[PDB]
Design a protein around this ligand. Structure first.
Ligand SMILES: Nc1ncnc2c1ncn2[C@@H]1O[C@H](COP(=O)(O)O)[C@@H](O)[C@H]1O
Ligand SMILES: Nc1ncnc2c1ncn2[C@@H]1O[C@H](COP(=O)(O)O)[C@@H](O)[C@H]1O
Lengths: 511, 513
């Protein structure tokens, strides 16, 4: 039904059609109050507008070569390239570039745009056989996500568990099967971290007692589905700031909601794994999604780092410190980190492997490496920024209102000039953009997001080790060590090309 | 003369035996105050020479040739190591990348200046010979020779220190300079510090007012007046006071970092490439190709070393029993991630390769710069991870294989120094001594210094990375994105229609009136 807002079944949503499709009485709360319409509400309207621009880009002729492919469904339509299964390394490369083009429309700041779960669509379409009796649901959801550009998110972090309560009363917190009916299954529970779910069409929900081993799809307007929002940096920036003062907070805020399911009916067409510990446990390795979505996440980060790199250079242009050797070296390190994530995405595509049914998966080692390095790189870049743009960021007048009151602005024009023949309005503008990138509450949330998602530092490293072991890479490395050890022993070399040291060993003489 | 004349065939590079013979040429090498007679038999160099020789042998093993070798492009009908012939596509670079890896695996990544390193200098000459003006033909001929023979070059390129308390002459004398121009070539004197493994090479490339200093040329190691002053020999010390079991890398992979001295050396004109030419000397790093090519070799070689270190760390932790703990597994996983990083950078070097001149391709340049910035950080971090996880394992190791072969000692070692996974004390001690030689022996300490410094100071590798971003136009593209962002609003609000003005929600008047 959300795709029925389209005037055409041969293309995805336009922006206007996407926005209309959101006016569906989804139950969203923020600041103790219910949200009437996310497309007009002061906490969500600009973020919605920003996603809508992504849908609009799909239909501009000049973009279509880089953003769009024909569908593979027979519809005669087109879609964003990452919404169709890749059948080669070069298909993955073109997808990489289509992701990048979308990400540039938010300067790398929206990390949960529709292309993130496009990979879940593709995973369903590439390996529907994985799902046994629900194979046909996988196929139909692939076709649907691909043709329409439906906006999914995944809500997947479990709610905390009070360990002093009884084991009676603590099952009620996880996503659980309440009841089986002919019209579908009824479920209750919660997932924390439903990033930008207020603006999506559906969410994927996934994980003894098989009543907990579920994976299914749930629409955002289903009765019983509710979002409890976190503070809105968009609304705070609108109420007490301005675009000039909070240029990113005001338009790219992706609210990290708690997703509550109270007694929700999930039709059988939306169920993918059902009371099935075996399939649930095997899905991360065999379902494909975990092996696919980090291509989008690495590219999105790399675009963000494109932005931060030049924003840092521009900030140092208006303080005047860019000329100093030590400042230049710090900027060069930021460049190297930026380059790194582009190169990892190159390797993802160039070393892609055939998977099933002709589908190709990006290089897996590169995905794990991206996950390990991104938190280190981001923390290090932010510290480089803060220790090089020093006071530039601290004293910035409170507000565009200061610039528009000539009684204040007269002093700003004199004492807050840019150091390269640049006027105070532009200097303040640049440095406020840098501040919103790193120090505003939005910037602080983004640091937390870049550091922690994908998981804890231990866990991403463990997953990296396990990929090396499971792929056979570690055993190949070990083969090399074992060969080295093979070539000598406590009596000397075991290979003929090397010289015994008996003729030069002086230990007998010394002792 | 002609070292390649030691080959029984002109249609293939040296065999190991032929290489070793080619080194018995009365090169003037000093170590420990003494002149070296024959690098192939001397206790400081003989095993390192044998290890390089194994590289030449591999080229002729049938089962290796698909990965290691191509036909030459000279018409000779011969073959060569793939990295010795110019690459003319991204896939050629990938095949070269794989051939470099196969060779590096024969020293487990520990020899960093094997012949494939300067093969990139040969290819640079063969790809852009016009660069050299009147010496273009020398470029062409050197390409052919290096390619067909597998000649072992090194570059000596760091200048000697300058006492700034002496007169302005006396400190002029000390850089490589033209002493005399003659019909038979140029006579040159000076020094280059850091001639890594030059004792085992055939030629060295030497390069950079007063145009007498703006030189680039080739010099054989047996030329009269060419001398090496060696550093301490970890090979000789390990042979003299240790054993293969005790110093399994020092004993065979030591690449002596020599000072290269030229006392009045005659360089024939056929060995000159740049002559009294500040313009060409200044432009050669960016335009000559070598700087844009050899990092492919150096990244792969490091990646192979990290393969080795990664599994050796795992094996060490199997010996102590600590591998099972979560925090140890996470540290090992980080080592894996750094290992993965350098393989991925080499993938990107090849896949994003660009057309250059005369049909040649160059590896992606941003990837080369990134490798150079990241390698010192990764290496120091890996070494610290090893030392904080294997720790006690490495400290107390009995002194010698001699302890194991004396049953009066070995009885105690067998009981108290067992491996923690049903592994006997001989294997436990063996693995951990291998790790120690990799990181804590003097060979290990030199390798840490080499991986960190090299390529240049930390500031400089970062500056070159920034400059590559700027000169390539990458930084201006990034900046166009920033300027677009800035163009979409001003001090009065949005300048684009799709976003909502906040005038309807701004509460500041109310708060402040
Ligand atoms: N099973 C576990 N054993 C030890 N530490 C853990 C475990 N699970 C999570 N942690 C740590 O708890 C912190 C938060 O992890 P998380 O809740 O996964 O974000 C991190 O420092 C993790 O390393
Ligand atoms: N022109 C320079 N200005 C400032 N520092 C330098 C310069 N050249 C070298 N250094 C520093 O001197 C140290 C040794 O550099 P190098 O001699 O290039 O290995 C490093 O810390 C470099 O950053």
């Amino acid at each position: 039904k959300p795709e029925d807002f389209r005037a055409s079944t041969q293309r995805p949503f336009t922006g206007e059609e996407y926005l209309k499709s959101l006016q569906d009485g989804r139950e969203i709360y923020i600041y103790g109050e219910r949200v009437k319409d996310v497309t007009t509400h002061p906490a969500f309207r600009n973020a919605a507008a920003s996603v809508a621009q992504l849908y609009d880009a799909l239909h501009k002729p000049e973009m279509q070569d880089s953003l769009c492919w024909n569908t593979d469904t027979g519809s005669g339509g087109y879609t964003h390239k990452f919404f169709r299964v890749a059948k080669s390394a070069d298909d993955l490369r073109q997808q990489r570039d289509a992701i990048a083009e979308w990400s540039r429309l938010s300067y790398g700041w929206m990390g949960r745009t529709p292309d993130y779960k496009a990979a879940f669509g593709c995973a369903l379409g590439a390996n529907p056989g994985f799902y046994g009796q629900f194979e046909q649901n996988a196929r139909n959801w692939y076709t649907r996500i691909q043709e329409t550009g439906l906006y999914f998110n995944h809500a997947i972090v479990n709610p905390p568990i009070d360990r002093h309560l009884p084991t009676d009363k603590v099952k009620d917190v996880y996503i659980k099967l309440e009841k089986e009916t002919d019209a579908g299954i009824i479920v209750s529970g919660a997932k924390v971290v439903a990033t930008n779910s207020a603006l999506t069409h559906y969410n994927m929900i996934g994980s003894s007692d098989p009543d907990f081993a579920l994976m299914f799809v749930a629409p955002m307007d289903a009765d019983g589905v509710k979002l409890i929002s976190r503070a809105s940096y968009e609304m705070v920036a609108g109420a007490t700031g301005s675009p000039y003062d909070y240029p990113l907070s005001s338009r790219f805020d992706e609210n990290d909601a708690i997703l509550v399911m109270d007694n929700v009916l999930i039709p059988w067409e939306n169920v993918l794994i059902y009371r099935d510990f075996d399939r649930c446990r095997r899905w991360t390795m065999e379902g494909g999604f975990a092996r696919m979505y980090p291509l989008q996440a690495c590219v999105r980060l790399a675009v963000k780092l494109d932005f931060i790199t030049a924003l840092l250079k521009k900030s140092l242009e208006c303080t005047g410190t860019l000329e100093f050797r030590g400042v230049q070296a710090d900027l060069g390190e930021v460049v190297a980190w930026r380059n790194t994530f582009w190169a990892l995405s190159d390797s993802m595509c160039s070393e892609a492997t055939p998977w099933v049914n002709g589908a190709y998966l990006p290089d897996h080692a590169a995905l794990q490496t991206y996950r390990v390095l991104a938190p280190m790189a981001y923390a290090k870049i932010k510290n480089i920024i803060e220790r090089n743009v020093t006071s530039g960021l601290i004293y910035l007048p409170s507000s565009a209102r200061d610039l528009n009151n000539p009684q204040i602005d007269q002093y700003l024009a004199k004492y807050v000039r840019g150091s390269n023949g640049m006027d105070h309005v532009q200097r303040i503008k640049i440095l406020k953009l840098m501040w919103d990138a790193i120090g505003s509450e939005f910037g602080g949330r983004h640091e937390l997001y870049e550091i922690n998602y994908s998981g804890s530092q231990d866990e991403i490293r463990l997953q990296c080790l396990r990929q090396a072991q499971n792929s056979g890479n570690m055993d190949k490395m070990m083969a090399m060590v074992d060969r080295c050890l093979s070539e000598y022993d406590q009596d000397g070399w075991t290979v003929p090309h090397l010289h015994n040291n008996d003729d030069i060993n002086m230990l007998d003489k010394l002792l």
